[PDB]
Specification:
CATH architecture: Alpha-Beta Complex
Strand order of the largest sheet: 1-2-3-4
PDB class: transcription
Radius of gyration: 14 Å
Helix content: 25-40%
Distance between the termini: 26 Å
Protein name: RNA polymerase-associated protein RTF1 homolog
CATH class: Alpha Beta
Keywords: Tutor, Plus3, Peptide binding protein, Spt5 CTR binding, Transcription, Chromatin
Subcellular location: Nucleus, Nucleoplasm
Assembly: monomeric
Oligomer: monomer
Length: about 130
């Protein structure tokens, strides 16, 4: 059956720390593609807002920038239902998805006509990561 809870989606969630740690390892893109992130998109009433987003690709931007203790030119091609955009890795959160964020994501997904991921797909991804 299909994913319905934030906890489930958490097993393929990548923190900014991990991304920072891995962004120079070959097959970074193979590893992170299909994973999900909690992406910071700005402020709402002067309070930071975040979104569930799927990594659909890794981009090599024209600009090297600072990511914690390292530097990279990489960006994440991130999908939130119908919305797809490239974000710098620095805007990824290290925190888990709120139920709220997850529900908003579900709503965007249904509005878009996009099937949610199954647990099989998710477990496949998780396992793959755990191995390499």
């Amino acid at each position: 059956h299909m994913v319905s809870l934030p906890e489930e989606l958490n097993r393929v969630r990548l923190s900014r720390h991990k991304l920072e740690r891995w962004c120079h390892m070959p097959f970074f893109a193979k590893t992170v593609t299909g994973c999900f992130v909690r992406i910071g998109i700005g402020n709402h009433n002067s309070k930071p807002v975040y979104r569930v987003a799927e990594i659909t690709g890794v981009v090599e931007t024209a600009k090297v920038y600072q990511l914690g203790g390292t530097r990279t030119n990489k960006g994440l091609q991130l999908r939130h239902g119908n919305d797809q955009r490239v974000f710098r890795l620095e805007f990824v959160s290290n925190q888990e998805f709120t139920e709220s964020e997850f529900m908003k994501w579900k709503e965007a997904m249904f509005s878009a006509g996009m099937q949610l991921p199954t647990l099989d797909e998710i477990n496949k991804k998780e396992l793959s990561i755990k191995e390499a």
